[PDB]
Amino acid sequence: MNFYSAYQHGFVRVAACTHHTTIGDPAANAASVLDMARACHDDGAALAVFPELTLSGYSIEDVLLQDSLLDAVEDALLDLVTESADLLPVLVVGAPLRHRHRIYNTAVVIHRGAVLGVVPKSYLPTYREFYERRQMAPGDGERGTIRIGGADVAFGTDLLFAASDLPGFVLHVEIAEDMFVPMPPSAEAALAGATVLANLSGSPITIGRAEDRRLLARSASARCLAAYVYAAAGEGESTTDLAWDGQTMIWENGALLAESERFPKGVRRSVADVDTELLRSERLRMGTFDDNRRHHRELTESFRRIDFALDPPAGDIGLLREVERFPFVPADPQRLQQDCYEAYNIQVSGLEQRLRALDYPKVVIGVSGGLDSTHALIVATHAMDREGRPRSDILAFALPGFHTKNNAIKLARALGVTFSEIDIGDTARLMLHTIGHPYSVGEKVYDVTFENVQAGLRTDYLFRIANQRGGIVLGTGDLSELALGWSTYGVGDQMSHYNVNAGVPKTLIQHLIRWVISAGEFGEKVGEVLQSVLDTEITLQSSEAKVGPFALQDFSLFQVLRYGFRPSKIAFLAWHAWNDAERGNWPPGFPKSERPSYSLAEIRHWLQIFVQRFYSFSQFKRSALPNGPKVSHGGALSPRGDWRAPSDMSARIWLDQIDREVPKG
Amino acid sequence: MNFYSAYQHGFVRVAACTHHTTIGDPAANAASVLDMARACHDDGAALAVFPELTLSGYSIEDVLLQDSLLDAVEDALLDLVTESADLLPVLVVGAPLRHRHRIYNTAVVIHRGAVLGVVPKSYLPTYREFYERRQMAPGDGERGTIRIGGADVAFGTDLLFAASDLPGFVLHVEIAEDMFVPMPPSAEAALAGATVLANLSGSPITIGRAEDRRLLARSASARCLAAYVYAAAGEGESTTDLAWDGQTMIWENGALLAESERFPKGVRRSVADVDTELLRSERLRMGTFDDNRRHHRELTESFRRIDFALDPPAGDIGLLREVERFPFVPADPQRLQQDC
Amino acid sequence: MNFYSAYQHGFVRVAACTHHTTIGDPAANAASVLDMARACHDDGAALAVFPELTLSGYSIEDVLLQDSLLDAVEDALLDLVTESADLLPVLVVGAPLRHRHRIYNTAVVIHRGAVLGVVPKSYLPTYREFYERRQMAPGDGERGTIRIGGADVAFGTDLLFAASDLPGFVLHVEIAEDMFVPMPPSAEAALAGATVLANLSGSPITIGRAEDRRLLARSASARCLAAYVYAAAGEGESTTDLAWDGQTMIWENGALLAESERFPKGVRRSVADVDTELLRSERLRMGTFDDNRRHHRELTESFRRIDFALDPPAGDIGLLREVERFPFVPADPQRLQQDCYEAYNIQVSGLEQRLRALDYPKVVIGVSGGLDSTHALIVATHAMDREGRPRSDILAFALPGFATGEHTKNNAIKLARALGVTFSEIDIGDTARLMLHTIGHVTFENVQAGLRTDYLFRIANQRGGIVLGTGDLSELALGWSTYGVGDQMSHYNVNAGVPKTLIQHLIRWVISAGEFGEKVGEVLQSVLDTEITPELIPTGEEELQSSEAKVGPFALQDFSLFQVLRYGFRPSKIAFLAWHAWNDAERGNWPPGFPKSERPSYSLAEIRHWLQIFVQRFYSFSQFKRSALPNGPKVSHGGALSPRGDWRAPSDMSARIWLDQIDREVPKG
Ligand SMILES: Nc1ncnc2c1ncn2[C@@H]1O[C@H](COS(=O)(=O)NC(=O)c2cccnc2)[C@@H](O)[C@H]1O
Ligand SMILES: Nc1ncnc2c1ncn2[C@@H]1O[C@H](COS(=O)(=O)NC(=O)c2cccnc2)[C@@H](O)[C@H]1O
Ligand SMILES: Nc1ncnc2c1ncn2[C@@H]1O[C@H](COS(=O)(=O)NC(=O)c2cccnc2)[C@@H](O)[C@H]1O
Ligand SMILES: Nc1ncnc2c1ncn2[C@@H]1O[C@H](COS(=O)(=O)NC(=O)c2cccnc2)[C@@H](O)[C@H]1O
Ligand SMILES: NC(=O)CC[C@H](N)C(=O)O
Ligand SMILES: NC(=O)CC[C@H](N)C(=O)O
Ligand SMILES: [Cl-]
């Protein structure tokens, strides 16, 4: 495959256009529309949506009832169709059309020189500033065909336009008022299989109406797990009694993909790349979506599929989509503040409940002065506080084996816990002898068993101290560690009584500590020590030198855990997010010296290591996993929760797919 | 008329409650619920909504399948009903109930010492952190009655609880996952005439889930031109694998009427005065609303109306609602900037 | 509540009767029926089912069309109805009745002086020895009412007879051939809410037809998750061309509850107590049952519920049910052998796969010479064998700390050396002695357990192997472990599925199969004799009996565990079941291998005490230990305790309601 073709990774480029209305002049509306569609063609778009009653103007009132206007609309529409023979995108053009007795408010769905369909507006508003049932007829329940340019084409509120070469691209078209009713045609359509929901809108602008437009469009994209395309009327509509801002916007599953200047001077587009695979995946996993479709089986099987071949460009056309470098760490400072709040509080509260259950025991914790331990200790302190329990019931322990520990003791004494040292070294010596390891005879062999003796002894001592003094062993291994198997399983740091860092990726612990210093509720000196830890630990490096940088691994982990995306898709997404340090945004707290940019070769390498460790090696360590709360919306790794997977499975197909699809550089 | 009685001007006081879950202890959940409902009574509320699976705890997994638990749930539920004989508000209490073959995730709608109804959850999520189809059965399409305390009461996803003395107050009840699907029971219900939409929710909290809760609840209140009552589970739910923030909130036609402290220490309420007349009027003028109901006439006439007499206090009880001095000039500076 | 009332524990007493047919004399058939019904009444039964065409005789052919016969049938049916006013059970009597144009092959459902309903046969067989469509009419699709004794009563294949005071008791009635077709009426009815499926059957006996009766009846009870009551025609049916064996049986969820003597001289009954709660629970947990009902919603909502108040006897009437002492260990030698074969094979095969995955590592196991470690070693050996891998990759380890010396460590060394594994001993004492001192010294037993597991893990790191745990299902249930750094943790637990009552018989199975050496067999029997016999003077206070002293006898806790894990039964129901199973050692069966010196009888007091301990340790304490549990294969049908499998429960939950129920309902003695 061409790795850099957005289309070949499941994307589909869509455009929401606002054009220059020339009320009463259909030929000039068709001119503006043709020019913008030709732009969409140059941009590689597959879809282009224009505003309500595009070809005549929405605001012309009883001028819709004049035969000369309807005739010019027909002529301009046929010109448009003929011109669309050389245009890539599917044009969705509003128009007042003649059928049976009346004129209906229709969107003509045009493609490659033919009319795929004609959708009538379903609910014509007749209230306040709207007088639509005067001039036009409702379409709710109209099926059959309509005759347009010597051809009988599908007509009704029950169409679907499915791309035969892009199965993720299945189009449905409603109009303005349609999406504001309790049961919108688009919802049925989505259950019926529509993935891109289009809305043509005239929408006279008003104080607070753009807010309502966004509310309903976003809510639609989320509830229907689909993409939503909205286009409103702009410059040219009669200002006899209304004004027009020409807003266009593109939503996808609740997230604004793009939007355009309000009240512009001149035509505007919103062009974006819709990840059909993200929709596919959200729908694969949300059983209740298909359950809802089944409950409404009769309503949903009555849709008609009009198949068409899009044949998109197969080359490099960029990616009109903002792939954030940190799926777990939003780069918008306000959103990151909210995220850190939520994470920190769910950790504290999960620990609080575990503590209340056990008659308020003690909290035994081994603190190394690194990030995860620091944060876990902060968490336990707050949990104990909110429960009105002495901080002296927290028992921090520095357990040296064979510079950073000073952070740990400074922090422990600042917080007010019970600090203590236990030099496991001698117990390690004894054990290494009793098993006959070369180090007890004096040859420096620092293999795995050497290091695991110390790790397991730290955990062993903590467990026995908990048993002796009546407490519980708080864990500190974080989500990215679980995803990679970067722990000692069993007798080791993997085991504990209640891990509060279990659901937190490594990349978000840094910002949780930054958040705690910012909130600074523990005190000034405590902020000083925490800040010290932050500056000390970043310049983890040891950890990230065998499993790769956690920025790239949390990127891959998010893609896998949330979407199950194949390796090639993760490589493409990571390369667009990370390959350039200047492009895209960075979250707060990243000095320009700690703002790296990774290459495709690096992404490919760490992706190989990731698929190997996550699908295959590491699973068994998560399989027997202490309790602890889920944090991110990307998921957790509990086998009693978000990740049910086998312990004895190989990652051959993932490595093989990387081999076949991801280029070496 | 008593000019200062909010009820006599079309208002109806509603409460969204988060209580103290005691997982596995139905009697203690009923205790917390009774205390909060007694508060709602003192506040003059007509409606009080509690979280998903209130009487047993939402997070207890296969403990729902133990006969001793189900039996204690039945006992606590009957105590609650009997105590509600002296309580003004309509109690909406979650519970795992026994019907036909399985246990359904139900909300018991209780009023003045009787059970007006029993609504089952419609879409049981079985994905990610959710394992609900294991223990419980879907209610989508279940009609008929259920036997609760020597009485056959209405059972199904098609109920409406209409106040015979407050025609603007017509209640419908869905549960959690119900409002997240493309076609939620509440929308049908609203076309069918429901004005106050209740949602009992367990909702394990997550980064960005409260945003989604608000998005869908507000979007529901706007699209359905109705009031939306949301109540999530709080302190007490098993933190084996999830955490719980206990958010409660009250929306009305897209506008947040009230909300409560997230991650509280102790029970919380959101009590607000819903202007049923504002809903009545928005619906009088939006023709396309009734047009939508007509297009779905068969779906919408199949609802069952359970009538009940609320008899609210007729005196001065304040007005739990922020009436802005300038309907044209919003007092929030950011909103006023946008408006200008 | 009365603790000894089978009814107040969800049971219902049912009867399948074969009577003395007197072909052509409806009065004489009503006489036999009334006598047997009065018997069932004295027994306290709620239901009594009689054979096809009871009042007339199934075999009287065209005499069914004689008006005098039909009239005598109606007269005897009305007599029966009137007499039933003082009869506890619901009578289901066959009769050829007049409706619209023809006579239908009906079962009259009679109760307390009134006719609850009239169910016609649905599929009249007309083939081979059967000529039923000649005299009678099919009832498939007949609804409405029928006039019987000046009363309009329900008539059709769509009825349900539900007890208003016994909600688990919902009766459906079909007739003979009905249950032999691809889609029997009883399956629909079960989906519709039927719990007891009744069959009136004439059934001329033939070589192998009792086999077909049993096959289909048991299959019905299993698939429909119901009780199936069967009654066939006996002495008195015309032997002009057929013979009649009068078989009656009562099935429950695929398990034969009762049956009667074939070809008897004189009438017979099969009376049993059906556990409605068992059905209720099987249906609570099998979502696909309700899934199937919903898929056929039209068929299943069309049923009509006829309500009747049974008012059963509230006293002690015993329990006509064989409750086995060892729910995990069947007392039938053939079934126990099959069980043990299956269990042993799934353990071996699960370990085989885990090993193939890891390119065949070594197998580190600490062997103390107790049952669980012994069996785990045997399984590991067999797994290594069948995968064609050197037995010297099995690393057994005796890690003693404070034991002075005992026969069990010799058991360990002897078995390991007889198997040909790689045995080594390592005295953890010093590390514990150091460890204790370092933490500033109950605690020391915790330290030893921790250090055993720590050392095994580090040795597996050193020599490139996986620690193979030995914890069994009973220890997991009750929390008899050291969590985390302790005997709970391993890389793969082969014994997790197996309860402790079954480990002994797995070892006996291995011995009797004798696939290993005769020396291996002798040492295994030594292990059995050593561990299952209490030490005269406690050997250092560590063995199997120590766990028994703290958590109660496993014979009782495995019983409670099966009930809880499979059926979710309330404590009082468990106490009732166990008290009937165990209180009398001379009654019921024992599995093979119990010398009559090891056959105890437990009291209500003991059952109640250990049940308190059990609900407290299972619902509340021990859950957090299972929550983080190594891999391993599920063994019994009763379930496992994996959090990724059969038991999803909270770690921070109290057992208060179960204790409160034990206090409110189970007597102190
Ligand atoms: N001096 C100390 N005092 C007290 N507690 C200490 C001390 N040192 C460590 N810890 C503990 O280990 C946790 C983090 O472990 S680690 O060093 O980041 N990673 C590994 O061991 C590792 C990596 C890969 C595979 N296997 C093992 C820390 O939270 C803390 O609980
Ligand atoms: N799927 C499995 N199921 C059950 N047991 C398994 C499975 N795979 C291996 N093992 C065994 O568990 C021990 C794992 O070692 S460790 O202390 O967690 N960490 C390390 O080795 C380590 C090495 C290199 C880099 N980073 C960490 C091993 O000895 C192995 O015998
Ligand atoms: N001397 C030994 N040599 C070699 N391996 C040994 C030795 N002793 C034990 N093991 C091992 O521990 C497994 C089971 O332990 S136990 O004795 O039944 N009970 C407990 O540990 C216990 C009970 C209650 C609370 N906490 C701990 C055994 O299968 C064996 O693998
Ligand atoms: N729900 C929980 N979640 C997480 N951690 C918990 C929880 N409850 C306690 N803990 C802690 O874990 C240790 C477990 O100890 S143990 O080695 O498995 N043996 C024993 O408890 C034991 C006690 C009495 C008699 N016999 C055995 C406990 O001391 C406690 O500190
Ligand atoms: N033009 C229309 O159909 C009405 C659209 C307008 N935005 C509304 O919300 O009603
Ligand atoms: N408990 C549930 O049914 C799920 C509610 C959860 N808030 C969701 O959006 O799916
Ligand atoms: Cl072990």
Numbering used by the authors:
A (entry chain C): 1 to 402, 407 to 543, 554 to 679
B (entry chain C): 1 to 340
C (entry chain B): 1 to 441, 452 to 679
Give the authors' words.
NAD+ synthetase can be either monofunctional ammonia-dependent NAD+ synthetase using uniquely free ammonia as a substrate or multifunctional glutamine-dependent NAD+ synthetase (glnNAD+ synthetase) using glutamine as the source of ammonia. glnNAD+ synthetase catalyzes the ATP-dependent formation of NAD+ from nicotinic acid adenine dinucleotide (NaAD+) at the synthetase domain using the ammonia generated from the glutaminase domain21. Here, we report the structural and kinetic characterizations of hsNadE and a direct structural comparison of the closed and active conformation of (1) hsNadE structure in complex with a synthetase intermediate analog at 2.84 Å resolution and (2) tbNadE structure in complex with glutamine, sulfonamide derivative 1 (5′-O-(N-(nicotinyl)sulfamoyl) adenosine; SFI), and PPi at 3.14 Å resolution. Both structures are snapshots of the enzymes in the allosteric state with the synthetase active site loop ordered revealing an exclusive rearrangement of the glutaminase active site and the molecular tunnels.
Closure of the P2 loop observed in subunit Bsyn reveals two close contacts, the first between the P2 loop residue Glu552TB and N-(nicotinyl)sulfamoyl linkage of SFI bound in the ATP-binding site (SFI-2), and the second between the one O atoms of PPi and Glu541TB, a terminal residue of α16 adjacent to P2 loop. The nicotinic ring like moiety of the SFI bound in the NaAD+-binding site is highly flexible due to the absence of protein–ligand interactions. Interestingly, the ordering of the P loops in subunit Bsyn (and symBsyn in octamer) could induce a productive binding mode of glutamine (Gln-P) activating the glutaminase active site in the uncoupled active site (Cglu and symCglu Fig. 3g).
